[PDB]
Amino acid sequence: FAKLVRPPVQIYGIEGRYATALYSAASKQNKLEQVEKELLRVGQILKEPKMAASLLNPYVKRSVKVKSLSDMTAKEKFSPLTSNLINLLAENGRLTNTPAVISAFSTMMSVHRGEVPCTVTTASALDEATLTELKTVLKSFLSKGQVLKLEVKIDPSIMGGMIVRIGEKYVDMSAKTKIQKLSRAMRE
Amino acid sequence: TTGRIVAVIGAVVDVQFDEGLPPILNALEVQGRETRLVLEVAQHLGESTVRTIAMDGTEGLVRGQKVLDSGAPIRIPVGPETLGRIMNVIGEPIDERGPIKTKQFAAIHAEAPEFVEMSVEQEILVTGIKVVDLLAPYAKGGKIGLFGGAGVGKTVLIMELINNVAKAHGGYSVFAGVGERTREGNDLYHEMIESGVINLKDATSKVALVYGQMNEPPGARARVALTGLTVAEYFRDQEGQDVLLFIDNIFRFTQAGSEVSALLGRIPSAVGYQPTLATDMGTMQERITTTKKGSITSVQAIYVPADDLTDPAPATTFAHLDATTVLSRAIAELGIYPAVDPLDSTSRIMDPNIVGSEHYDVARGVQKILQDYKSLQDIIAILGMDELSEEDKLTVSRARKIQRFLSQPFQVAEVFTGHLGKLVPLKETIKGFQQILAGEYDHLPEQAFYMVGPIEEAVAKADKLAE
Amino acid sequence: TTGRIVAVIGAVVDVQFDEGLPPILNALEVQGRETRLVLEVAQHLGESTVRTIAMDGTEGLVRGQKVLDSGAPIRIPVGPETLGRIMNVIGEPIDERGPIKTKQFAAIHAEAPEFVEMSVEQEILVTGIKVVDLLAPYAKGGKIGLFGGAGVGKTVLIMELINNVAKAHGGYSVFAGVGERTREGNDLYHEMIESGVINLKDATSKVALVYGQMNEPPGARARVALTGLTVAEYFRDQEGQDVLLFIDNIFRFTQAGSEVSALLGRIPSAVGYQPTLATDMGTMQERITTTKKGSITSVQAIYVPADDLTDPAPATTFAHLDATTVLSRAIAELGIYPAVDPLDSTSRIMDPNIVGSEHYDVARGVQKILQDYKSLQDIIAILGMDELSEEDKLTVSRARKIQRFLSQPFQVAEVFTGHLGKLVPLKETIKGFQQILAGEYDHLPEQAFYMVGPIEEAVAKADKLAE
Amino acid sequence: VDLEETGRVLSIGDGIARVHGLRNVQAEEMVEFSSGLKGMSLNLEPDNVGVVVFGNDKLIKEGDIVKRTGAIVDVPVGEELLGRVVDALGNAIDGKGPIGSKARRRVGLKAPGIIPRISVREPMQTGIKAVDSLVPIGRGQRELIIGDRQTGKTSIAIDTIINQKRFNDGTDEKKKLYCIYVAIGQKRSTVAQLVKRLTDADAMKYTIVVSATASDAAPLQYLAPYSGCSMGEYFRDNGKHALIIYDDLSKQAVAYRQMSLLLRRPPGREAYPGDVFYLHSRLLERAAKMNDAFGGGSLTALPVIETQAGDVSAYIPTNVISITDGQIFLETELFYKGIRPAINVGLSVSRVGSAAQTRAMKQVAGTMKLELAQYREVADAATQQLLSRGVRLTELLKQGQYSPMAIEEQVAVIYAGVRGYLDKLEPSKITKFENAFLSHVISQHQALLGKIRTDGKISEESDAKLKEIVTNFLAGF
Amino acid sequence: KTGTAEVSSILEERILGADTSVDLEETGRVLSIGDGIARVHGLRNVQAEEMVEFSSGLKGMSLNLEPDNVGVVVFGNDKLIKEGDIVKRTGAIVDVPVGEELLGRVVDALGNAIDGKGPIGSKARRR
Ligand SMILES: Nc1ncnc2c1ncn2[C@@H]1O[C@H](COP(=O)(O)OP(=O)(O)OP(=O)(O)O)[C@@H](O)[C@H]1O
Numbered sequence A: 001f002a003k004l005v006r007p008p009v010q011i012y013g014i015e016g017r018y019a020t021a022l023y024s025a026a027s028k029q030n031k032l033e034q035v036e037k038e039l040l041r042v043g044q045i046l047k048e049p050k051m052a053a054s055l056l057n058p059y060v061k062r063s064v065k066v067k068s069l070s071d072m073t074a075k076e077k078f079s080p081l082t083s084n085l086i087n088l089l090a091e092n093g094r095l096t097n098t099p100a101v102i103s104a105f106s107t108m109m110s111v112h113r114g115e116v117p118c119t120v121t122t123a124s125a126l127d128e129a130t131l132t133e134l135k136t137v138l139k140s141f142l143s144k145g146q147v148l149k150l151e152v153k154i155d156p157s158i159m160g161g162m163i164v165r166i167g168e169k170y171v172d173m174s175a176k177t178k179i180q181k182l183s184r185a186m187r188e
Numbered sequence B, C: 001t002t003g004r005i006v007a008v009i010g011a012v013v014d015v016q017f018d019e020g021l022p023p024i025l026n027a028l029e030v031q032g033r034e035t036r037l038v039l040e041v042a043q044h045l046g047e048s049t050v051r052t053i054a055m056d057g058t059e060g061l062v063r064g065q066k067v068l069d070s071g072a073p074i075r076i077p078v079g080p081e082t083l084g085r086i087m088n089v090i091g092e093p094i095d096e097r098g099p100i101k102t103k104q105f106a107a108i109h110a111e112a113p114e115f116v117e118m119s120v121e122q123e124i125l126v127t128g129i130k131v132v133d134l135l136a137p138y139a140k141g142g143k144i145g146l147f148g149g150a151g152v153g154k155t156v157l158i159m160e161l162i163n164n165v166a167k168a169h170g171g172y173s174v175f176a177g178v179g180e181r182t183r184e185g186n187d188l189y190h191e192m193i194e195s196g197v198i199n200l201k202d203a204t205s206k207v208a209l210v211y212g213q214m215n216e217p218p219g220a221r222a223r224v225a226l227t228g229l230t231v232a233e234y235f236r237d238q239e240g241q242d243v244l245l246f247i248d249n250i251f252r253f254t255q256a257g258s259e260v261s262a263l264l265g266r267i268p269s270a271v272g273y274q275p276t277l278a279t280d281m282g283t284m285q286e287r288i289t290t291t292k293k294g295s296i297t298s299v300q301a302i303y304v305p306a307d308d309l310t311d312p313a314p315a316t317t318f319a320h321l322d323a324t325t326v327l328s329r330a331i332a333e334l335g336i337y338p339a340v341d342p343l344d345s346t347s348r349i350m351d352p353n354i355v356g357s358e359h360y361d362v363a364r365g366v367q368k369i370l371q372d373y374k375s376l377q378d379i380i381a382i383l384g385m386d387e388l389s390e391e392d393k394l395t396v397s398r399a400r401k402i403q404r405f406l407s408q409p410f411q412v413a414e415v416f417t418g419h420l421g422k423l424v425p426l427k428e429t430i431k432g433f434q435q436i437l438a439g440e441y442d443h444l445p446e447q448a449f450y451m452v453g454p455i456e457e458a459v460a461k462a463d464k465l466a467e
Numbered sequence D: 001v002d003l004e005e006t007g008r009v010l011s012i013g014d015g016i017a018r019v020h021g022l023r024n025v026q027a028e029e030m031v032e033f034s035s036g037l038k039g040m041s042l043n044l045e046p047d048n049v050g051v052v053v054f055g056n057d058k059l060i061k062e063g064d065i066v067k068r069t070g071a072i073v074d075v076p077v078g079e080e081l082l083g084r085v086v087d088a089l090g091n092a093i094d095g096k097g098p099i100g101s102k103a104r105r106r107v108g109l110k111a112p113g114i115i116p117r118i119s120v121r122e123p124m125q126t127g128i129k130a131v132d133s134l135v136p137i138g139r140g141q142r143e144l145i146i147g148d149r150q151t152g153k154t155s156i157a158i159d160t161i162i163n164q165k166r167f168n169d170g171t172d173e174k175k176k177l178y179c180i181y182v183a184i185g186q187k188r189s190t191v192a193q194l195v196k197r198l199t200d201a202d203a204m205k206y207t208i209v210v211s212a213t214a215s216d217a218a219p220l221q222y223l224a225p226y227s228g229c230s231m232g233e234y235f236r237d238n239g240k241h242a243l244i245i246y247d248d249l250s251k252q253a254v255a256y257r258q259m260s261l262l263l264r265r266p267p268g269r270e271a272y273p274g275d276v277f278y279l280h281s282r283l284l285e286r287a288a289k290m291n292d293a294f295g296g297g298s299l300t301a302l303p304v305i306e307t308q309a310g311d312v313s314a315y316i317p318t319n320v321i322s323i324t325d326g327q328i329f330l331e332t333e334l335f336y337k338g339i340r341p342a343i344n345v346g347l348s349v350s351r352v353g354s355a356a357q358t359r360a361m362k363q364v365a366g367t368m369k370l371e372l373a374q375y376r377e378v379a380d381a382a383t384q385q386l387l388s389r390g391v392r393l394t395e396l397l398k399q400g401q402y403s404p405m406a407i408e409e410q411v412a413v414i415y416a417g418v419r420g421y422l423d424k425l426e427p428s429k430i431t432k433f434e435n436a437f438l439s440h441v442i443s444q445h446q447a448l449l450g451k452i453r454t455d456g457k458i459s460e461e462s463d464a465k466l467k468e469i470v471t472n473f474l475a476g477f
Numbered sequence E: 001k002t003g004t005a006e007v008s009s010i011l012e013e014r015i016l017g018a019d020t021s022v023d024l025e026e027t028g029r030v031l032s033i034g035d036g037i038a039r040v041h042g043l044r045n046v047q048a049e050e051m052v053e054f055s056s057g058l059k060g061m062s063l064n065l066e067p068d069n070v071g072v073v074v075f076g077n078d079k080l081i082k083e084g085d086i087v088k089r090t091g092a093i094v095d096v097p098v099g100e101e102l103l104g105r106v107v108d109a110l111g112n113a114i115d116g117k118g119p120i121g122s123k124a125r126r127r
């Protein structure tokens, strides 16, 4: 078979297989950025209430769906890769999980351009200076060229401190866990 | 309408109809086939796909062959021109005597007569056979189970029933052979030709044969009972007469249904039978009734797996039977014919409210005396014949005379007995056994009752052999 | 929080919370119903969906309907104000007497007592029943179990035990009827009202009733045993008292689980039972223990499917009991009542260091003679009781006398048979069996022992038989 | 197309359609297919709806239009149904016109709780001596009739129904009993003959017949008991007395097993699902006896079960024995021998109805039960006496067919038998005596029987006059 | 739901228009192989119970024709067959030689002599 080039992050499931096929197809020939832009475009194109209502009805024949999608793709001037992907999803009847593919490829493209999603959780918000030093130290955690994608949720359930996720790495300096640890130490 | 074969797993074929789907149970013909292949729809998988059970070998089919939607279920030729003609499940003749020419076609998937097309009063079918008509009368439009099935006279009895019913009441008959050995099928064809119930020359036949062979796929052996039912339903409704329908074998009907259910991918139920066993049997057995126009009396040959009467197959068929006949090897040894076990035979209508008080009392007396003789036979075997009283030797003599009188000579067995067949009416039988029980004939020899028609023939035989 | 129903299959409902997910066991309220429908959470499916079991009929649930999280598991009213009342799964009174006014609620899903809480005391509880007291002596504070198929005497025996034990009981009592007849619960309610054990117009009621009878869905039968357990636990832990917890029928707690397990998408285990049978049974049955904070003397009626003690449910329950009492249909067909099988029944306190040496010796002698009789039975049944040595005939006679003597007339059966209820103190039981064993009563007829109190009543019966 | 109140059949096959749409369809709601059938929406799934079709799946096709009716599965109930035959959905099948009913009741409605009920205090007369004297059935009871193939169970049910005419022709509204006969998985020929038999006995004017014969799809056989039970619950809740006879409840179990297996559910023991016990208890818990604060009505139930080769410890027989308030074990050995009704009084019990039995019958049947029990244990002097008396009683309890007896005649006959008047009569002639004796008391001495019936007891003067009658008659026989 | 031909290799081929240089009518590419069963992609013109021939010299009988793939049963050890192989139609249902040329010869299930007495005469074939 054709030795497909594997994506960086492995997505699994039906969306995973379709997205890995698309990523392998795009990586050779080199069209990942353009195909991602086209995928984002079709993200809205199909979302149109008329098109969505006409594509979620399984009683319109697959022939009509494929013809309508060919007309839409021609009317939008896509790469042959995206047009063939939409045709393939339509033939197999996998339109109801099309967004999961566009989502998957996004997750698959973000890692391609080097990104490590991050999460920070605190009892209360932060002052921008402290957020800046967090940015600096977390970028210290990463490697070379690996941009960071910070997210700062606020969880009052914890009683203070901080909780930080960098990919699968996890550091929990929250008051709640220290309280739990010390309390359990007492009871033993 | 035209679709394409998309899948072929064994005897299951998945077809795809881009235009319009055929309802369930229709028949589709595969175009591009050296011999007619018919597929019966059974599911609607969605995406315009249907799943069909094949009625013939699917080998040599290609993913994409065109399939033509007939538009109605399997339609067979029904009429008076099917009498004496063998034909498989889809109605094509297989006796190589040309097409079955008829002006009528009937779909094999019909519905049982509504609640108002139903006779509300029981009846009795007089077959002209002493033992059957006395100890186990055959209800009109009621299923009769027939046991034994091995060199005891099942075929000769079937042929005699055919002849009597076509001679007394004038109705015809259908013989649906479900899962039929081809050797025995040909043998039966020739036995019918010899005995005369089929006539290849003058077109005066009395039987329509419908063979679902034993090497047809499971989807064909499961439907031949329905083809036979259709052929008989024509005569009931359209001709307005009483028909006989011999189903041999019924266990093979249930077994083929089970195989089809498994092939379609359904979880088996009790002993690995189809989950739809009760309804699969009921949909057929509910078309063998006594409508207000005619009636169909069915005779199922029955096989009991593992000799277990509680196996789901016979446990489900016995729920439908309205009578029972038990041919026994132990009675063909004695030279009695038909070798019907007088005591093991049963009937639902053996009720004084249905068959009348006199008939009921005669039958009960005969059964009681036969049981008494059976009990006394142990004493004879052990303590010796001397030990009997005089009110027991008399019962032994009377029971032996009754056993002899229950035997009869058939019209379809004149090349086995040297006598001439008798069709004994009912009143003759009841009077004969009433007289024998009363003791009016205690002075005659036992052999004067062997293989004779009415009682007067026994008198004449006694005169002829004593003088 | 607020989620929306997405699936509603049988009694299993899927609810999607976009905001905070509820933990497991947490209860939810379906908003928009005529009555209160509580959904107990059971799984997290990902994508912010939770599968739940509905504590009431789910008909009328619409996809997209709104469900409101409650924040805590099913909390029921507990206290001394739940005595004389009738409750259901979710703590709602069903006696039509007003809300249960308590100042303390208990979640029905507490954890079992730790290991440092168990109590090792082992006393003997005298029930006034000869077979139970002699061979399988019940213990105070222990778990007891009555095994038996349908219609062998489980409920009659448990009502006799209610009567006896819970009349001579100064502590509280709790009857949880899970999956039994509703008219049986009504009869129990009215028997208690008449017997003074319940005061509808006072505060001297000593029995709390919980009821999830058979008419209720599978989600209510599963989680009603837990409600009874919680009501009993309060009276144990908090009030620090000695409780009686009768359950009937506990099989219906596991059965109900296997009804929802199928719908929870879990692979069935042995005979279609949920894969988690033993774990659920254990978590339920280890909360009924007698700890150091109090005592629970729980009697549980356990139903044996198709009279099969090899079934996973009774077979698993056996390991959670101190004393058993395998009621048998074979014995019940002989007329013996209670049909306790003396050889299947066991007990932990059948120890010479707890019951004594005369009690232990007598019990073992009775068991030995009954086992010898069981060994002989197969030969006795065919060859007859004449091909037996004299010692064997003596054993047969003694064993039959003992079998009959173990039968007793209960007071709760006064209506059935018209006899008079009898209690038999332990000393009288031991003395009577000593006498029968020694041979003191070999001149009496075995039918002189059938259904009598102490043995002197057997002697009086024999004297009356002589007349 | 309105994808909220209407959907399209995604996939038919097995008798379980999958529909796409019906976004506002309630669980267990009834929907109507385009062709004409009806279905019940079991599985509300995220993407479709599993509708069980109450009919033949042949008529349904992928693409058809399913329209929700808007109401939970319910059936028409009322007085308008008496004398009519109806399928499992309340649509008449006897062709006598539209059913025309004003009230509709849910088939899945829940049984009454613990407070509405009250102990069984009234007798349900069956006109069968063996049943009425030895295993009495009260009103509100659930008395299983369990037997084999052809042993006379439908005969018990039909004799009960035919016997209720003495009360349904009178004026006392507190004794009239309205019968319902649910026929499940049963030959339609038998149902038609049974309906003719009832019409000939003038027993249809107060009888409903619900049919789900063997040619009817599995969902209809699964749903017929609930339709019948709602038709009976109407009378129960309206202060009247009803008597529903499910026949059989094992055919319903087979239909439900088919339904479950076709849905790919985990088969259990004998391939029956786990819900079979719930299936039957849900149904038999509705035969209650309401207390006077709720009307005082009642709904008796006489479920019928067909054991297999006499196996009473099977799975479904044991479930229904754990659900019902008694038994009437009909034995095939006895039936074939000659005893009919072949009730095996040894194993047949009635836990509840013992206290509802009539005093006049109570006193006589008590000694009858003791005598039969003693005879059962010895099968010289006292032994010979017990054998003789037991055989007399056993031949006394034999009965004809479709000839139910009033309680007073049963009292007279059993009294003659148990007081030893037939202790000299040859054991064979007892029936000949019986059928003769009744005629005598049914002709000349109506005053005595009427007084017994009105007073509801065998008073001492009634006892003396009955003694005189029996001895004088036995003098000239 | 899922199909066995939805593997990312087939979808990759079809996305960039590489499915037109492969003759998916008389040839196929093995998707799976295991325990003597191969699942082949293609062979759109293959008849039920027809014999296909793998690239490695083995034979097989195509029994299960599903929408996505063909289930072939291999006539020998599946050691030699690897995912991605090439399977060619033979065109004819399985048949065997017949005649008096077989008498006294030990043959295997397909009419090949296994007694080492030389070739098998064989004038006629039979399905
Ligand atoms: N009391 C009776 N006296 C004489 N005969 C009887 C009596 N009851 C029933 N029978 C006979 O038994 C036969 C079957 O009776 P019935 O239909 O009541 O049994 P069943 O169990 O309903 O049968 P099935 O199981 O086939 O429905 C009848 O034909 C009838 O003649």
Ligand SMILES: Nc1ncnc2c1ncn2[C@@H]1O[C@H](COP(=O)(O)OP(=O)(O)O)[C@@H](O)[C@H]1O
Pocket (backbone or CB within 6 Å): B149, B150, B151, B152, B153, B154, B155, B156, B157, B337, B338, B408, B409, B410, B413, B416, B417
């Ligand atoms: N009425 C009869 N007279 C003479 N012979 C009979 C009669 N009935 C059956 N037989 C004998 O029974 C044997 C078996 O017949 P048949 O029933 O046709 O075969 P099978 O039992 O295999 O179907 C025959 O050889 C025949 O001689």
Ligand SMILES: Nc1ncnc2c1ncn2[C@@H]1O[C@H](COP(=O)(O)OP(=O)(O)O)[C@@H](O)[C@H]1O
Pocket (backbone or CB within 6 Å): C148, C149, C150, C151, C152, C153, C154, C155, C156, C157, C337, C338, C408, C409, C410, C413, C416, C417, D321, D322, D349, D350, D351
């Ligand atoms: N001690 C007893 N004396 C007489 N009969 C009894 C006794 N115990 C049980 N029975 C019989 O058993 C029946 C009650 O069975 P029960 O135990 O209530 O069923 P289950 O086992 O389902 O609870 C009664 O009808 C009665 O005839």
Ligand SMILES: [Mg+2]
Pocket (backbone or CB within 6 Å): C154, C155, C156, C180
């Ligand atoms: Mg009970």
Ligand SMILES: [Mg+2]
Pocket (backbone or CB within 6 Å): D153, D154, D155
């Ligand atoms: Mg019946």
